[PDB]
């Protein structure tokens, strides 16, 4: 969705920055720019000014303490952000074709534990959805424009699970129903949903969250909605295995067979929890 361009958040910390110190912009970089790129540009431009051992990038995203900062060094916080729309603002970017025209809300996500780490288990993992609002709205005559308001949102560990699932249920959806299909792209998505060898994979999710119907009904809205996102998941892996069967040649027969022996192993295991 870099039909709109690439957007990073840039904050400046340190006396050596004069008029910038403690300002926060949103930069509009041209589409497909990698965090590596601009961070190299920014620090390498201020390595040309102040001295190389003076520039330090805040390889982070959640907010900035200052007493932890060497008051001699120049610190930059660089963070990728995405445009953020109302559920109404989005609907209208679907029908009408002109879409790049009021970009003034941008969002990043930062994870955390209550333990003060960055990551945890599935039952430990929180997420902060931060929304930045800008002084003007892109496109606009300058390429940076500085932040003015700001909103934290907190996702409970189950909401985080739900968000992962939905993203992936649709990753299938899209690769399946696309023409001309990309076999390599679809197998990659599918083999990583049902045939995961590295990360913990979807079954451990429903085990954590879907093994006890919670008493608090504020939490039922979440528990049950996770159950339904699994029902829709399971139906999109079937629908994908079914598609990849239409697509592979001889060499991937055992490959495909294993992806099927996987998904059936898994849907058996799922069905006690999803009912």
């Amino acid at each position: 969705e870099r039909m709109f361009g690439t957007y990073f958040r840039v904050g400046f910390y340190g006396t050596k920055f004069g008029d910038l110190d403690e300002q926060e912009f949103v930069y509009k970089e041209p589409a497909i720019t990698k965090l590596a790129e601009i961070s190299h540009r920014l620090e390498g431009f201020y390595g040309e000014r102040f001295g190389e051992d003076v520039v330090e990038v805040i390889k982070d995203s959640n907010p900035v303490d200052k007493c932890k900062l060497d008051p001699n060094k120049a610190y930059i916080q660089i963070t990728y952000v995405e445009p953020y729309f109302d559920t109404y603002e989005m609907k209208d970017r679907i029908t009408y074709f002109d879409k790049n025209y009021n970009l003034r809300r941008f969002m990043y996500c930062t994870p955390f534990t209550l333990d003060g780490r960055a990551h945890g288990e599935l039952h430990e993992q929180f997420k902060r959805k931060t929304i930045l609002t800008t002084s003007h709205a892109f496109p606009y005559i300058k390429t940076r424009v500085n932040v003015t308001h700001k909103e934290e949102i907190i996702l409970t560990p189950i909401e985080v699970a739900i968000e992962d699932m939905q993203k992936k249920t649709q990753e299938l959806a899209f690769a399946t129903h696309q023409d001309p299909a990309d076999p390599k792209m679809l197998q990659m998505v599918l083999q990583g949903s049902v045939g995961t060898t590295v990360n913990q994979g979807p079954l451990e999710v429903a085990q954590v969250f879907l093994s006890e119907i919670p008493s608090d009904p504020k939490l039922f809205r979440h528990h049950n909605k996770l159950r339904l996102c699994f029902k829709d998941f399971t139906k999109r892996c079937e629908d994908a295995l079914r598609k990849n069967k239409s697509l592979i040649g001889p060499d991937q027969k055992e490959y495909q067979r294993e992806l099927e022996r996987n998904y059936h192993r898994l849907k058996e295991a799922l069905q006690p929890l999803i009912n």
Binding site: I32, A36, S61, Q125, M188, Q191, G192, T196, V198, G201
Partner: protein, 178 residues
């Protein structure tokens, strides 16, 4: 055209994954939003042409020996990974990882990718590794092994300072396109 299939193999716990996901999602190693699924996709621009690159992420344990090469057919390119501060992961590249992908795909090109090169130049790990009778892997010694085994080239990167990270994935696509 269409996706390029890059299958990534290497000893577990060398940050194979930590650098896959942190590049492809514009996160630092510190802020990547975790997940349960595997494999990552990323458009990479190269000369005003946009190429999409599927990243298949394989477990490194012997347990998955029987099942890993199922992902090998139709692979376009391979990333073989050791961490330069991990002299077992480096020897597991001569004696396991490279003999395998070239058994199954004797014509699919491959790259040597050294990783975590920030602890090489770190004065607390070198005198940590040396107090075990080992040094880190200089690029000198890695470069030969790649020529020794006719990899396209060797590339090293830091997940954490993003150094040479983009060069890794840029070479991959170039390798595949030839």
């Amino acid at each position: 055209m269409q996706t390029i299939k890059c299958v990534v193999v290497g000893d577990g716990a060398v940050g194979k994954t930590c650098l896959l996901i942190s590049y492809t999602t514009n996160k630092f190693p510190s802020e990547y939003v975790p997940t349960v699924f595997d494999n990552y996709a990323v458009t990479v621009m190269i000369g005003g042409e946009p190429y999409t690159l599927g990243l298949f992420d394989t477990a490194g344990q012997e347990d998955y020996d029987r099942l890993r090469p199922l992902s090998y057919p139709q692979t376009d390119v391979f990333l073989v990974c050791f961490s330069v501060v991990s002299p077992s992961s480096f020897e597991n590249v001569k004696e396991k990882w490279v003999p395998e992908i070239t058994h199954h795909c004797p014509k699919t090109p491959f790259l040597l990718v050294g990783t975590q090169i920030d602890l090489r130049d770190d004065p607390s790990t070198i005198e940590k590794l040396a107090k075990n009778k080992q040094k880190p892997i200089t690029p000198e010694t890695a470069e030969k092994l790649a020529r020794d085994l006719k990899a396209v080239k060797y590339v090293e990167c830091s997940a954490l300072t993003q150094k040479g990270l983009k060069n890794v994935f840029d070479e991959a696509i170039l390798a595949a396109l030839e």
